[PDB]
Amino acid sequence: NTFLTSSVATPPISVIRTGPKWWADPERMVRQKLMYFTLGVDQLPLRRTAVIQRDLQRFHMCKPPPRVGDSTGYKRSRAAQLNTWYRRIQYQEYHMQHLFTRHVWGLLRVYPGNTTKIQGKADDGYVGYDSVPFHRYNRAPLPFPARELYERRK
Amino acid sequence: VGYTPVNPDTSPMVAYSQYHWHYNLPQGMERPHSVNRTFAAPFQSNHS
Amino acid sequence: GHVMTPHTTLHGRRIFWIPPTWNRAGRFLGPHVTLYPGMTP
Amino acid sequence: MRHIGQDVPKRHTHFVLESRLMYEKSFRDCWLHSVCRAISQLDEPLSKTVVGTHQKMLQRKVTCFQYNQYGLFKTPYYRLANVDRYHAVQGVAGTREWVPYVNVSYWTMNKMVRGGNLLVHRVHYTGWGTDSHLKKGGWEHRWNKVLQRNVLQYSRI
Amino acid sequence: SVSGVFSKGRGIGHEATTSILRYIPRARVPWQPSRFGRENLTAADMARLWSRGRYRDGPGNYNSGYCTERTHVLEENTVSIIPRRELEKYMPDITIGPKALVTPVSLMNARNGHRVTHDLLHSYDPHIGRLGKPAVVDHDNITVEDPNRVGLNAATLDCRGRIYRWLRRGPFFQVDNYFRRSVKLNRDGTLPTDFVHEAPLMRKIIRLAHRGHLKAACEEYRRVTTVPPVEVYRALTACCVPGAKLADAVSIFEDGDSKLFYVSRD
Amino acid sequence: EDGIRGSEVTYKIVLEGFWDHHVMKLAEDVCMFLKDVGRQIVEEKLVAVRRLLQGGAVDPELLAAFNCARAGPFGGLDEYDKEEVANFLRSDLRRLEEQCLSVINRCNVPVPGATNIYDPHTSWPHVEKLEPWVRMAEFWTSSSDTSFTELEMSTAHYEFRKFFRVIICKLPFQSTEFEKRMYDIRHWLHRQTSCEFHTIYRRNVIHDSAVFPTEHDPATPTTHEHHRMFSFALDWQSAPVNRLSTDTVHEGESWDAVAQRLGCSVGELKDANAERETIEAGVVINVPVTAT
Amino acid sequence: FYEWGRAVKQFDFIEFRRRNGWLYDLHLMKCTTKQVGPLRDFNDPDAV
Amino acid sequence: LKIAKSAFGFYLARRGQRKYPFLRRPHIKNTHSMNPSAPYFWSFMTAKSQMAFLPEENYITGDWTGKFFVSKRQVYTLQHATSGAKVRVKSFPSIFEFNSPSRWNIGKEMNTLTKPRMDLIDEQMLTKKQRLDYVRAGLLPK
Amino acid sequence: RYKASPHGYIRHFENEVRDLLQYVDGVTPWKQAQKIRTYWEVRSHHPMPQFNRPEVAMHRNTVGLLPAHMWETDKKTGKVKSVKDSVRDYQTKTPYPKWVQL
Amino acid sequence: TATPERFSVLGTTHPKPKRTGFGRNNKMRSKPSDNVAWYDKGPVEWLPRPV
Amino acid sequence: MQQIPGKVDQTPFEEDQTWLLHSIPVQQLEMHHHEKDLQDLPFINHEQFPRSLEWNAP
Amino acid sequence: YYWSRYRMPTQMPKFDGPAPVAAPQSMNSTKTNEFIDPIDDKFPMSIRGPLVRPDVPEDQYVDSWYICTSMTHHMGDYRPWSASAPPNAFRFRPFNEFDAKGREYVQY
Amino acid sequence: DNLQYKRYDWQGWYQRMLDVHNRNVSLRCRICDLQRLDGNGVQFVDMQTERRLRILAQHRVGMGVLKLDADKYEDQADNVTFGTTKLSELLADARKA
Amino acid sequence: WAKPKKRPKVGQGFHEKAQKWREEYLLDRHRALADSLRAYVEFSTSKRVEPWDARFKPFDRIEKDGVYVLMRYMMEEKLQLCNYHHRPVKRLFCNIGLMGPQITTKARWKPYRFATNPAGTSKAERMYQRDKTVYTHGHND
Amino acid sequence: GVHRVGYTHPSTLPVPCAQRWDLRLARARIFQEYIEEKAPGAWQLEDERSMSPEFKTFTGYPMRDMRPGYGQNLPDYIMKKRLPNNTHYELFARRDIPNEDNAMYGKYLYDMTVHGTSLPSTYRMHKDINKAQRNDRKLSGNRFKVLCSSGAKNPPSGWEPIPDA
RNA sequence: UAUUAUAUUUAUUCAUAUAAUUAAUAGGAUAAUAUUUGUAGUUUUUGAUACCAUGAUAAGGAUUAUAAAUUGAAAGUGUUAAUAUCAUAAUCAAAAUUUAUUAUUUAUAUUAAAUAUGUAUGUGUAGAUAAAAUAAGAAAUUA
Ligand SMILES: [Mg+2]
Ligand SMILES: [Mg+2]
């Protein structure tokens, strides 16, 4: 991993709201798929996501279907329910990506960006060479040189 | 309008007015001028 | 749009009576103008 | 003088005339100045014929001559003030407050365009224009194309 | 009740003419009958006026180095001048003198028509630098003070029409005036051709042409300030004959003829 | 070359207006003018040519010009008789008649329903378009001392424009008369319209192996050191170099010894010096220009 | 040719014409006065 | 301008905080000209080449009566220290004198020896409002 | 007066350059042009005229460059507290460069 | 020359104050913030840092 | 590129590191061009005559 | 006088009478353009069509100086599209075989 | 200029300024027409002479046309002199082949 | 656009104060300069932490193999002569050639300010514990 | 690589042939050319932007040279540089001036030829007319300010100003 | 009610001016002859100024919609034309922060040409604020 510096975390929903621009950008989604496939694990959530989003993109310039007014509000609530389903289908994916990426990085002897967990290796966030001399969230002092997660041979 | 007067060649609001030639009319020369031919001056320099 | 069509009041294809003039209109280009032309054969 | 019988409404218009004379002085001094600069700063030998102690000597002789020239106009052009020939309003060139081909300030350009005095053509305020070259690469590109037809189309001899 | 700029002034023209001339009414400019111009300033006042108007370089400005005041006040603080003898102790004197201010005629075209590197522009015509008398530039005596007041001063009284005149001048103005105010046929019908300071140069040209060095001779012909004598043209064309150079013989002849007063017609 | 693609002289008149239609209609005007004047001149030339074709003598001078060679292609001084020379002359005149006729015939194509002055096959002279000069001015419309933002938000775009048409006339010969009419069209041009005149003509240059001789590279070569900055002003003369056309005869010398020293045939050295029959010591002599 | 348009020479030529009393053709020096009215139509008096 | 510190206060507008093209601001005010660097000491705000000659302003060019201050692009030379002659420079309020000569100055331009913006402030050139605003920024005590 | 005049670029001015040189040399006494100094000749009298900037050779700086005898150090910190006066005792055989005789 | 014992006017002036805080307008406190990760919940820290 | 014979010289570097770690500087002050300086900046684009940018010298 | 030129040659039309049919006249709150024709804009685009100016090859139009509007560089004369092309030219075209680009690359 | 700078005190300097803006004189010749028998029966420019001509004048040749643009002097006359000279000097050197 | 208010007069005896303050600001600057030159040179002369980032390859490898072998036997002397300053160290690695294209491409180096720490540096805090009285631009210890 | 550039003189070859460097010196004599001795062999860099048809900005010629440090200062820059003489700067110097007609002719000349007389500027005329109007009602809000004061302070022997009320 | 959606995203440490005289014309080689080479008559006026001394163009989204079509407005933001009756204040370099009205580069490699910024590492952390539905990708609470 080349990008090492401390970062700003964005809530999952705003990441998903980027649609085609980032979250569903074809290019990105394909190399996620590559990671999964190479690990020998089906990519179902990715495929659900890709389906939902593919279709989002196809109809993205159309006006929504005409609404008739109801005291029930069954329509509004069914649209909502469907929507939060899709949101959750994608939360699951977003989680999977962060999960597997961290795990794979643990196998590749990769050091993550500052303040990032790698389950077996760095439990509290890993940090080295931050702009700030302490670990940001522990409030503990950082050693020089940067802490090493892996034994030396390569 | 001002103490500095408009100069009639560069201003389209003079040039294209009703008292002059608009840019959408046909732009040919109006009348010929023969000055030097009709009455000619003899050359006398200011310097010897 | 509808948030500006006080200020777009000249901008469609408009028959005029008196055409606007540069003293009275700062940025308007004229009624015949097409800013976003499509390609036509 | 001393505001007795002044002919022009703005006194400062005269400064514009002063400016003209500055450019005149530059035409009179540019070649000279630059030659003295180039011969002064040259580290490599000047030539086959002038080398070594002669060259060092001649260099110092020249910069001594150049320092002796009182009133020789060395001021770089971008440091001269731009001031209107009409209302004597000033603007920084390369900024939106100075208009280069008419050489008037924004204030005068506005006044002159709106009451028709300049003949220009209005183009949509937000784009690059009617012009092909500007449409391609913007200001820098058009700048380049001007260089190309002033200089590069010639194979000099 | 009366506020003047200048206390006293003087007449441009002298007793013999004026005392009689006054009986003939002269028409003054209708809208401003009285004229007090920069010819009419006294000597002192002219000096003062002429110092000012030259931005920083000019002698008027207290820090130019030409200042005659012994003291100057910056924001209530009085500063005493550092004399030049003292200034020199840490700031070496490299001063060529007035010859440094005048380039040769040879360079006049590089310089857009000038021989003079002074701070005011110097015109070679009679009128722009005219005071009461016609302007004449000394190339030996050029000073920062400029006693004859022939330079084009940007800010002085009466300057404006002079500046305007200078900006209207024709493409060869400097050059033409310089050339016609010197170099003109003598009252006897003799050619201007024989001058003491240029003689050895003409000799050298002739000499070079007789030994058949056409290029060296032509290269010296270039540096001639004054009309060259007939003998030069004779020598130069005679040199063109044996190698058959015709184009060159012809351009030589045509150069000396009807440009230079027809020295070449011989 | 034949037809449209070749000529002795080309004039391009570049007309410039402030408005496009101005320059378009000016180009029609000037174009029809040159069509008429062109036809008149070229017709005149054509009758001169037809007369020269019908018959004529040969200059002694033109014959002499064919016969100046030390050796022709067949490796000896060649004798052109007046016949042959007249035949060359005649062939060129033939070609000139074809070209004249081509110009005239295109002058007569463009009638009122049918006029197209853009294609060169259909008319003489023809017209080429030239991309317009367009400068866009960007500036503040506000006068505000207080805020930069408000100044930027008021920005206008206006353009200066200049429009151009080009008129091309290619002629098979050069006529000062045509050139004169053409320079004079600037006096009757349309209102607020100007023009340039481009000329491309053919001209004889002369390469003198005498003034610019072709010699071996010097025995010592020239370094990069003769090329410093200001080497142009210091280490070099302007070409051509001056080589002496006059030499003095040394004491023991003789015609052939002098010729040997100067690098000539003795014949040459005698021709250049024809006045002198014999050469004494200390006498001044003319060096034949071909001398090596 | 570089010098022939100077104003001094243009106005001197005018002065020469003035001493010979022929000013009729000169541009600066003539003031046209008379205007030529339009031609009426029987197709309408009304149209202004 | 709001306050006129010179004549130009009358002629010029500020135009808020307005952007100028790179390295052209109409008025050359070199606040940075004395800005300490040990490693860059000989390259910062000095001649780009050490083989350049000293400027015009280290020399007496013409016949002078005398000067009041020497220019600030003049470079401090061993003689400036040794000769014991007046060396003045125009700074604000009035003039800065080099009174106490040191060799550590040598070879740098007086631009670099004269602090343009002093940590010292006159309370008497300040309006009561301006003094308030200087207390807000934590400069003046009050 | 009627001459062919070069234009634009300075190369084309070869003639003029020669003349400007000749003239300059003729008018300008060596006695005066002596006195014009180059920055390094002047800086030779600064107490620390020569060292490497950080870009290339920085690690080649030596402790021998420091003029330690010029200043006064604090023993505990290892820091420069004061600087001795430079000018009073300063002896040099070369106020101007060796080749300058005024 | 010869660095003096006392400086009359040099240290005389009012000392610039230390900033009390950080970030925008120097007024922000140092405290735990939203951007802070939680390492106690699951394999991924939360919210997850960019990867 | 032709070079002066007898002069010790270098060839354009093939390795990225050779470029990166050499002493080549970055542009820092305002930037100059010997022809283009006369037309001041790209925004002040000085034009003596309004010739077509495509004008062709005869 | 130099000014003798700027006199009126003809008597200018008087203002005798009232505002024209469907004039803009503004009551208590009215947004009024003097510029827009009241009657000819109100008239449906379906009927009148999107045209502002006659449908004619645009070479006949000039973008006016100082007025936001186009004018005809021959006052008021109009030539129809048919007069730009050859007789009976398919989609008025210099030649019927191809469109502009088709013509270019065929030629190449 | 026929318009504005036609007739008054500025007509002179504007005229001269155009003339100096226009000093360039383009000198062309086809290399084809240089290959001809010289007065001595030897071909004036042969293959080797042409190769040498091309290498000597680098970007000054294109489409087999040698083109010199003579800008050096303010007046066109002097530029045809100059241009013509450079041409014969360049031929003189190319002919060494 | 309001007429500009006039500026109050300068001060009385402020010309003396400004003279003195600038005078001894300069005198102080002499010692600040002297001291920072001392510091700069002391830094150039003294050793630094290793410039390469060991978290990546070819540097992570056990100190008994690979690049470290290449360093211990061929480059050691030179690496010590330049005191592990990051610029000459990286250049020496380019010139040893037995790594070759990798130095810039595969290998990672510590950031500027970390690489500048004195040899022996244990805690990161050290970057901030260097002297601020001295004008070296972070080139001081 | 770091190498010594090298040159084989044709006399030494087993066929004489004209060496490209020698030709280069020929070309430098003909069009007089500065040969930069210090030009680094490694620095050949075309200007990608203008010289590659891949960028929209493609002029076909090397618009700028890509050298970071290059400045108007350097003798090399000075040697190839366009002097300001007869460029647009000169055109501005002459044609852009406060009253544009003073570019075409002397005002006095024109006025005296066209009108019989010199005419004051419009501004001056305004102040004149105004004085006449307001001197007709009030008097003595005035002042007497001249260029030269002696004419008022010692007036001629005659000159007895008409008393006013 | 039909002629159809604000609750999304991204932002916020913002500073820069100085060394007083505005008043008119005047032509040169290749022209049938002008020393007009070197054209010489001080002195009666007063406003745009540092100063009261009218006019005129900015910015500022809130309901004429989709087709062959523009998301920038008139209500006026220093410099401009009839009120005068304290004063030379104007850049041609190298210069002195208090002013509402300003998007700066945040950790592998860091000062070469006009001289060009030494300072604020602190858990992306108060209060309060900014911008956008336009070749992009946002969809349901009108008067
Ligand atoms: Mg207002
Ligand atoms: Mg002034």
Automatic annotation (TrEMBL), chain C:
Superkingdom in the source lineage: Eukaryota
Record organism: Trypanosoma brucei brucei (strain 927/4 GUTat10.1)
Protein name stated in the entry: Uncharacterized protein
UniProtKB/TrEMBL annotation, chain I:
The species this protein was found in: Trypanosoma brucei brucei (strain 927/4 GUTat10.1)
Protein name per the record: Uncharacterized protein
Residues of the full protein shown: 1080 to 1181 of 1181
UniProtKB/TrEMBL annotation, chain K:
Transmembrane segments: none
Provenance organism: Trypanosoma brucei brucei (strain 927/4 GUTat10.1)
Coiled coil segments of this chain: none
Protein name, UniProt field: LysM domain-containing protein
From TrEMBL, chain O:
Region annotation (Disordered) ranges: 132-165
Top-level taxon of origin: Eukaryota
One of the record's GO cellular component terms: mitochondrial small ribosomal subunit
Protein name: Uncharacterized protein
UniProt organism field: Trypanosoma brucei brucei (strain 927/4 GUTat10.1)
